Symmetry: C3
């Protein structure tokens, strides 16, 4: 397999370098724009430079290890024009991937995650540690599912949706593009575009756009 | 082992056909009363007919893959008179079954579930994906534990109890027959028969009967 | 390896005898002060006597299998003077221990627990079943993390902190010494010393000292 460039040397990039290693991949390094991170390492893996150096590594697979759905979309749209780069799909050896699971390029399925049956993910999704996506779940592009999220059957998550840590989503709930579910929320109603909901039961906090 | 008939071709039957396959079982097919499902398949496995065709398959093990505790009880009482049929016990290879675990016929323990020590389950129980039953937990017959439920030590769950996804139950809590705990509930008090409780902390919503 | 003495023959000691067995350890027995437990067993393992018999077993490793952080501290300070005894570190074969994980003596990591990267634990910590400690998490001494707790990145847990079952802690939150987070709490603010917080979102209930 090609060596991997990880975009993002923060908390998510730290954990995705670990995922890559567990997947048997060689990480060439990170690209990160943070001034303080130039010349730095995570566990023997160098920050090689800024995102505008990505054209130096067309021989590598990429993943965008940045938790914010919008930040991944923005990076793809600016730095990764269609067909110029290839993207890894990283599935932790301890993740459970069942039957009729469809996962598009750039997606990261972390340790202990469970996707049961008939689950569809778009490009550059994240399913973090110990999260569960039950039967018939659909994710759009650039969806972030945080650790321990509980995504019940037939839930639909639009593009650039974020589901916070240990939140719970009732079966058949639809979450429209750009919405965010706070950590620990108990979601029993559909959510409209760009809405942030929090609490038990989940209620509208604010709109993100 | 005998081939398996799965009663219920909905969301739970979909996931239990997957469980059966993972357990090395051959699923002969589903029985389901849904008109729209006659002549249909889940992933190469046929809906063979209606529940009143169950006497055609006495050479098979059965499981009742229907999430509603009352629906499983009703099906057993009408269609499965004592000693006429045999029932599978399905334990996912990725479920953790510890020591002095007692599980009665027809029970389904799904992927990533954990039963630690001194746990007792009655007949036709479901412990769904990533749920944890800690030391001394007792389930009656026809108990449903949804994905990611957190059932602390020495909790007692009566017959036809349902514990919703990612709910949490305080140690030593008793839940009397027929009660339901909403998804995400934080249960710190005993629950009486047929009560539905929701929220954090869990409070009485309504009575189911 | 040395045979193990487990201090505490209650619910936690029951589960830690199971952990020890899974770790390939031989448990010589329990020490427990409970009058009713003298001459009793858990699953072929005897209660040998009271804690003041610990000097009879300097040839054994010890673990303090008592959930209360303060009870472990009190037992260590009274019965286990510095350098007189050795302590086991027990990590369930189904726990995931990632890279640059530092765990001090007497710590118990239970079945399905996940510590990702750059996690530091002090002495006599407990990480119970299916809990997740994400990148950069730091635990002091005598920290209890209950089943299914969701401890996000860069969270700091002081000494004698207790995090209740299936609680969720927002990234970068600091919890000062002696605080307790109720089961199912959604913690989005720092917590001060000896504070008990409950609920969604977590709010001050009382002070423990
Ligand atoms: C490995 C990893 O670490 S992956 C990362 C895992 N982390 C997550 O999933 C955390 C996701 N983040 C959240 O849930 C945040 O709490 C957010 C984004 C919803 C809101 O954060 P902020 O915009 O900083 O909101 P803030 O904390 O200032 O709170 C504003 C109000 O909303 C409430 N609130 C905010 N978040 C939540 C929540 N998750 N649940 C309940 N109430 C909440 C607050 O109580 C406050 O109410 P008030 O006006 O009555 O005081
Ligand atoms: C693989 C799988 O998918 S397995 C399936 C996993 N799914 C589950 O576990 C979900 C279990 N279902 C639930 O928890 C449901 O929310 C139920 C059954 C408790 C209630 O559903 P309904 O009867 O449809 O109640 P409904 O949604 O109309 O809400 C009624 C009231 O209760 C409240 N409420 C309902 N459920 C909950 C909940 N889980 N938590 C908090 N509040 C709740 C609502 O906010 C509403 O309050 P209001 O009167 O102030 O508006
Ligand atoms: C394998 C295993 O079993 S490991 C063990 C796992 N167990 C745990 O993690 C449980 C931890 N314990 C808790 O969370 C407890 O609920 C505690 C310690 C916070 C409080 O317990 P107590 O001191 O007995 O408080 P009590 O139950 O009397 O409730 C007092 C008030 O706080 C509220 N409250 C208490 N705990 C909680 C909670 N976790 N969430 C929300 N509200 C709570 C009650 O609703 C009550 O409010 P009121 O005054 O409005 O009636
Ligand atoms: C949005 C964005 C972020 N970054 C980097 C800056 C930070 O080091 C990193 C984000 O790290 P951090 O803020 O910890 O968040 P995350 O959980 O997504 O890792 O991403 C870029 O290099 N370019 C970008 O366009
Ligand atoms: C109660 C009941 C249900 N069913 C079928 C109808 C539906 O296809 C199926 C239930 O599917 P569904 O409604 O998705 O719920 P579950 O989560 O339990 O699968 O069970 C019967 O065939 N007979 C019965 O007596
Ligand atoms: C605090 C303390 C407890 N114990 C014992 C008494 C009980 O049997 C046991 C605690 O069991 P229990 O009360 O079930 O709680 P836990 O979850 O910690 O097991 O610890 C001692 O023997 N000495 C002590 O100093
Ligand atoms: Na798990
Ligand atoms: Na959870």
């Amino acid at each position: 397999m090609k060596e991997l460039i990880i975009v993002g040397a923060g908390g998510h990039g730290n954990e995705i370098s670990w995922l890559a290693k567990r997947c048997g991949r060689v990480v060439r390094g990170f690209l990160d724009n943070t001034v303080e991170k130039q010349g730095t390492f995570i566990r023997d893996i160098p920050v090689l430079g800024t995102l505008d150096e990505c054209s130096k590594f067309t021989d590598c697979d990429f993943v965008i290890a940045i938790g914010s759905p919008r930040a991944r979309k923005k990076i793809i749209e600016h730095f990764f024009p269609e067909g110029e780069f290839t993207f890894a799909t990283l599935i932790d050896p301890t993740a459970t991937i069942g039957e009729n699971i469809h996962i598009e390029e750039g997606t990261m399925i972390c340790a202990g995650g469970i996707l049961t049956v008939d689950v569809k993910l778009g490009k550059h999704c994240i399913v973090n540690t110990n999260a569960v996506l039950s039967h018939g779940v659909i994710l759009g592009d650039y969806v972030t599912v945080a650790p321990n999220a509980s995504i019940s059957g037939d839930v639909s998550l639009g593009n650039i949706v974020e589901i916070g840590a240990n939140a719970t989503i009732r079966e058949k709930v639809s979450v429209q593009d750009g919405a965010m579910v706070g950590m620990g929320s108990v979601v029993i109603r559909n959510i409209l575009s760009n809405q942030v909901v929090v609490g038990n039961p989940a209620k509208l906090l604010k709109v993100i756009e």
